[PDB]
Design a protein around this ligand. Structure first.
Ligand SMILES: O=C(O)CNC(=O)C(=O)O
Ligand SMILES: [Mg+2]
Ligand code: NI
Ligand SMILES: [Zn+2]
Length: 331
């Protein structure tokens, strides 16, 4: 078995190997990359996402989210308070202000220490989940707006044509902006490109150990667990590496820098934080290997998770027994 310790693997495809996206994902899996839940892909030196980032300041962040924490430094939830709209140029200025800027630090490890010590005491503002793309239309390789759609994959594998669309999302971050422990909708893959700015630190649990994370989460968030049998789908809970290590949960960590892709694999729980002002683009995708994960994915039916239009068909076709309850939670 390749990669039996479930380490995060880093890949350096050549420009030739960068042509065929599906083929390269399958290659990474042949080397055991999925066992970690997360892989890094460093693009060939010849490649670029677009020519420059000099003209992005007028993008609108319609609903910036202030991420307010509750709990203790290593075990907390966050809620999202909606703020007034602002442009990316306004948000960048805000991120660089004395109130929100990255503190002085020695290295990524020191900054990580500072994040876990101090995150709860601040409420950073995240420009998340903005439909759109920063890939140039002329970028032919690993262009996250030109991937094969999940609806097409389901149709190719299973023969059933379904409604729905699959488009990318932009994320504008600042110091301490946080993504809570989650797997993707329907335990899909994700791919994330860090277009510009400061790094993003990731934590990940191997898919084969995801249920160990879930059991810890039920212990640590006992009211939330009574409320919902899949409350990590709410995407609000944080658990620090120190707490994970104290509880014997297998995990790994890695820091993504600008110009790098990360791929999350089906049922790979992940969480993390931004180092400072940045912009990422991410999208879900599927492969043939995903189908069995989609059929087994948990679902929130309590009403909290509320998701896209396109998840309906995935539930309806892959999980017909669950469909009626889940749809009630959507309505
Ligand atoms: O970058 C973020 O805030 C969150 N991204 C992801 O969870 C992802 O790409 O799957
Ligand atoms: Mg602009
Ligand atoms: Ni994710
Ligand atoms: Zn729920």
């Amino acid at each position: 078995a390749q990669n039996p310790n479930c380490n995060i693997m880093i890949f350096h495809p050549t420009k030739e190997e960068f042509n065929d996206f599906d083929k390269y994902i399958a290659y990474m899996e042949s080397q055991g990359a999925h066992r970690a839940g997360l892989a890094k892909i460093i693009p060939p030196k010849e490649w670029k996402a677009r020519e420059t980032y000099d003209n992005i300041s007028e993008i609108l962040i319609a609903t910036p989210l202030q991420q307010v924490a509750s709990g203790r430094a290593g075990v907390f939830t966050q809620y999202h308070k909606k703020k007034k709209a602002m442009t990316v140029g306004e948000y960048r200025h805000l991120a660089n202000s004395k109130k929100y800027q990255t503190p002085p630090h020695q290295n990524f490890e020191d900054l990580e220490r500072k994040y876990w010590k101090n995150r709860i005491y601040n409420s950073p503002i995240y420009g998340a989940d903005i439909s759109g793309s920063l890939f140039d239309e002329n970028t032919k390789q690993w262009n996250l707006g030109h991937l094969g759609t999940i609806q097409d994959l389901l149709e190719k594998e299973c023969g059933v044509v379904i409604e729905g669309v699959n488009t990318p999302y932009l994320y504008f971050g600042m110091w301490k902006t946080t993504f809570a422990w989650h797997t993707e909708d329907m335990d899909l893959y994700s791919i994330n490109y860090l277009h510009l700015g400061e790094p993003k630190t990731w934590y990940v649990v191997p898919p084969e150990h995801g249920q160990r994370l879930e059991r810890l989460a039920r212990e640590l968030f006992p009211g939330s667990s009574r409320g919902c049998g899949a409350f990590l789908r709410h995407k609000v809970a944080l658990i620090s590496p120190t707490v994970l290590k104290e509880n014997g949960i297998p995990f790994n960590r890695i820091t993504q820098e600008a110009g790098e892709f990360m791929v999350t694999f089906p049922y790979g729980y992940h969480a993390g934080f931004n180092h400072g002002f940045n912009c990422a683009e991410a999208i879900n995708f599927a492969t043939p290997r995903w189908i069995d994960y989609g059929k087994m994915a948990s679902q929130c039916s309590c009403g909290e998770a509320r998701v896209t239009f396109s998840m309906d068909a995935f539930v309806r076709i892959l999980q017909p027994e669950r469909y009626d309850l889940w749809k009630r939670g959507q309505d």
